[PDB]
């Protein structure tokens, strides 16, 4: 999918997590976010289209998604333990990273 679509998936599923009634619902949303993060990691964002594919900026962009997956995996572990509120709280740690990448590269 394109980068915009993967971003919509990330945004929509974070809202699902916030409104969830159980940890399995959180897990289902996080699973979709994990895939969207890894698919977005394959894209070249418009603001970096003129940079080398091997540039420090492109590696920083790609590594931002690895860190999003770090947080998603943290939250998934908690969700799979049935810990709904803790999994929701772990997912909120994503937000600073959504905004930090946007500040650089959106
Ligand atoms: C870089 C490592 C990113 C991370 C982490 C997140 N996003 Fe992102 N997002 C990124 C870029 C470069 C762009 C612009 C894409 C473009 O083609 O202009 C975006 C955009 C969004 C949007 C707007 C969607 C659109 O239709 O353009 C949303 C709603 C969005 N991003 C959400 C979002 C969330 C919730 C994230 C954390 C869970 C997140 N992004 C991380 C780059 C990066
Ligand atoms: Cu972090």
From Swiss-Prot:
Stretches the record annotates as Disordered: 38-60
Q: List the disulfide bonds.
A: none
Function in brief = Electron-transport protein of unknown function.
This protein's record includes keyword Transmembrane helix: no
Q: How does it assemble?
A: Monomer.
The species is: Escherichia coli
User: Which annotated residues bind heme b?
Assistant: 7, 102
GO molecular function annotations of the record: electron transfer activity; heme binding; iron ion binding
Localized where?
A: Periplasm
What keywords are annotated for this sequence in UniProt?
A: Electron transport, Heme, Iron, Metal-binding, Periplasm, Signal, Transport
Q: Which GO terms describe its biological process?
A: electron transport chain
GO CC terms: periplasmic space
Per UniProt, the cofactor note for this protein states: Binds 1 heme b (iron(II)-protoporphyrin IX) group per molecule.
Name of the protein described by the UniProt record? Soluble cytochrome b562
Which stretch of the intact protein is present? 23 to 128 of 128
- UniProt similarity note: Belongs to the cytochrome b562 family.
The prosthetic group or cofactor this protein requires is: heme b
Using the UniProt record, give the first listed, main subcellular location: periplasm
Top-rank taxon, per record: Bacteria
Composition bias type Basic and acidic residues, residue spans: 47-60
């Amino acid at each position: 999918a394109d980068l915009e679509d993967n971003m919509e998936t990330l945004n929509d599923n974070l809202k699902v997590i916030e409104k969830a009634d159980n940890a399995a619902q959180v897990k289902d949303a996080l699973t979709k976010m994990r895939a969207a993060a890894l698919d977005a990691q394959k894209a070249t964002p418009p603001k970096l289209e003129d940079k080398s594919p091997d540039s420090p900026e492109m590696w920083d962009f790609r590594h931002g998604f690895d860190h999003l997956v770090y947080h998603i995996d943290d939250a998934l572990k908690l969700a799979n333990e049935g810990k709904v509120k803790e999994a929701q709280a772990a997912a909120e740690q994503l937000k600073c990273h959504c905004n930090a990448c946007h500040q650089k590269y959106r």
